Amino acid sequence: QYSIEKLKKEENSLAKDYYIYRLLEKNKISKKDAQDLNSHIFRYIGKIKSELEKIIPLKPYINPKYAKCYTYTANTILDANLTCQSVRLNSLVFIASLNSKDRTTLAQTFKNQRPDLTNLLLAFNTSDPMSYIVQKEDINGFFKLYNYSKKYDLDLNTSLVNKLPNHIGFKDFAQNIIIKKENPKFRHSMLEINPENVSEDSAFYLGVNALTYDKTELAYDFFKKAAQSFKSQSNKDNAIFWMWLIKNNEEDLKTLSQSSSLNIYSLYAKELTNTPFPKIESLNPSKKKNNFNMQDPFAWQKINKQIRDANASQLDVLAKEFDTQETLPIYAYILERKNNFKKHYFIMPYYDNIKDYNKTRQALILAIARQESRFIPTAISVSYALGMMQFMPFLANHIGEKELKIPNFDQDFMFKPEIAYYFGNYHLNYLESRLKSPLFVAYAYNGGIGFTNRMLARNDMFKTGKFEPFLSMELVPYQESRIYGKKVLANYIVYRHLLNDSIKISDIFENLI
Numbered sequence: 001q002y003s004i005e006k007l008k009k010e011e012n013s014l015a016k017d018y019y020i021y022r023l024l025e026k027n028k029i030s031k032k033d034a035q036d037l038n039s040h041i042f043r044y045i046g047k048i049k050s051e052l053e054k055i056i057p058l059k060p061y062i063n064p065k066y067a068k069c070y071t072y073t074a075n076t077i078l079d080a081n082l083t084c085q086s087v088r089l090n091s092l093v094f095i096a097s098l099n100s101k102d103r104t105t106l107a108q109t110f111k112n113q114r115p116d117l118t119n120l121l122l123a124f125n126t127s128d129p130m131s132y133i134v135q136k137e138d139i140n141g142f143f144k145l146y147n148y149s150k151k152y153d154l155d156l157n158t159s160l161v162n163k164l165p166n167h168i169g170f171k172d173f174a175q176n177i178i179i180k181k182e183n184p185k186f187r188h189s190m191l192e193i194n195p196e197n198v199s200e201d202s203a204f205y206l207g208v209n210a211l212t213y214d215k216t217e218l219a220y221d222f223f224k225k226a227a228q229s230f231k232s233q234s235n236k237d238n239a240i241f242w243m244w245l246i247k248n249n250e251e252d253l254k255t256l257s258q259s260s261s262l263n264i265y266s267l268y269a270k271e272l273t274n275t276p277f278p279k280i281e282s283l284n285p286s287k288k289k290n291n292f293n294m295q296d297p298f299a300w301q302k303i304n305k306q307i308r309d310a311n312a313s314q315l316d317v318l319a320k321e322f323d324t325q326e327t328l329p330i331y332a333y334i335l336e337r338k339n340n341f342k343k344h345y346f347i348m349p350y351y352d353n354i355k356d357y358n359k360t361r362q363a364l365i366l367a368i369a370r371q372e373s374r375f376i377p378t379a380i381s382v383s384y385a386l387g388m389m390q391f392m393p394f395l396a397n398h399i400g401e402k403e404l405k406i407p408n409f410d411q412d413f414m415f416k417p418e419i420a421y422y423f424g425n426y427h428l429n430y431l432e433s434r435l436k437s438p439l440f441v442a443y444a445y446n447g448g449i450g451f452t453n454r455m456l457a458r459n460d461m462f463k464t465g466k467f468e469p470f471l472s473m474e475l476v477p478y479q480e481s482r483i484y485g486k487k488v489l490a491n492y493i494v495y496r497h498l499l500n501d502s503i504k505i506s507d508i509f510e511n512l513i
């Protein structure tokens with residue numbers, strides 16, 4: 001392994017973070033090594049933060065200007081100057097902590113300048129603050145209360161619900177309560193939001209909301225508004241698909257069958273309309289090799305930043321440089337960006353390691369690897385998932401040390417295609433044998449089998465129903481996994497096709513119920 005001094009000479013990157021983390025967790029960083037260190041951390045969040053602050057806990061940070069203001073409590077707040085008073089009253093917990101006499105006083109003080117404060121102050125002098133804020137139609141206060149406690153739930157009138165989307169907090173709020181199935185009175189009130197007043201994801205989610213109460217008309221209008229406003233074509237297609245499912249206008253399905261975006265919805269539309277399968281590019285570079293060390297994590301991280309920080313002209317220079325068999329995953333990575341994501345790249349690198357698996361298992365492996373890494377051997381994620389199949393270190397060690405007992409096993413073996421594909425196959429077997437559907441497998445690869453089993457046990461998920469299974473696909477409670485499923489499923493269809501082992505996507509959907 002590389003020492004801390006040798007890491008310090010490399011550019012900040014997720015690779016460097018990973019390796020610093022690995023020293024940390026094996027307790028190989030002294031208090032003296034850890035001094036100048038958070039100048040060397042590319043992204044100072046998560047576990048590397050936790051770990052480095054067990055050595056050097058951070059004193060900061062409260063602004064030197066308001067330092068005075070954090071020396072008062074709910075007992076001494078009326079002794080605070082007027083700035084200090086207003087600063088501390090940013091916290092709804094602080095306000096809750098005050099007694100009701102002090103709230104009445106402070107509320108008189110602020111009714112002129114800060115009636116936002118006044119309203120919250122007076123709100124916490126009632127048994128139900130939300131109800132007070134709702135009656136005042138204080139939008140800022142509504143969201144402060146929502147962030148403070150998710151437990152307030154109350155019917156909102158048309159006037160008020162239509163003001164809510166104007167606030168930055170609305171999107172997360174709506175997605176939260178609709179996916180989690182919380183705040184039933186909020187959700188029911190959101191049926192009266194005018195579609196004119198929302199766009200993009202908010203409008204999409206309000207469409208899902210409307211379906212759950214069997215309000216198909218409002219749902220369509222919500223989905224329509226989502227389709228017209230969405231930035232990405234994939235999302236636009238998701239919304240058009242619903243537009244069609246609800247009303248069945250063939251204009252909508254045709255638009256969807258003709259989409260440039262390859263996704264489960266455009267694939268399904270093409271199947272229903274007898275539209276041919278989309279053009280999949282074919283990359284067979286003659287040249288066999290170049291310099292590039294495909295096993296070097298640091299080399300990838302630098303070439304990666306070059307590919308993001310590159311004008312459409314610098315890309316052509318990289319494309320030609322990496323036009324080899326050895327660097328085929330990079331070639332395709334560059335190409336994908338270069339042609340502005342209009343062409344469809346579905347490579348099959350390191351094929352010898354999977355050619356003996358049945359074709360259906362091959363497709364799943366490839367589908368997962370495409371989404372997880374675009375087949376970059378030394379790919380590292382923000383949570384330090386490793387290699388082409390993006391194994392979390394816990395699971396990689398459990399498999400390699402305990403289950404497959406590989407000799408001299410290190411987790412950096414996940415950077416090896418032969419290992420990635422083999423551990424991938426192993427883990428996929430465990431999941432397929434319990435879940436069957438490759439969609440369900442995909443949810444569990446990403447978010448674990450506990451989460452997936454909890455979801456399938458539910459009465460209202462992946463059961464029979466008017467809009468099933470598409471509705472349940474919209475209600476998978478982890479956003480990361482909800483998206484991952486859709487994408488891996490589309491990769492699966494495509495890879496089964498390229499492997500001369502086609503399946504109708506409608507068959508996939510029937511076996512979800």
Ligand SMILES: CC(=O)N[C@H]1[C@H](OCC2=Nc3cccc[n+]3C(=O)C2)O[C@H](CO)[C@@H](O)[C@@H]1O
Nearest residue numbers: 371372373374379380381382385390446480484
């Ligand atoms: C390298 C990386 O961060 N991969 C993550 C992957 O990132 C999606 C990627 N998507 C794309 C898309 C186009 C080009 C390149 N990439 C990537 O390199 C990675 O997202 C998954 C969840 O959906 C994560 O589990 C996975 O670790």
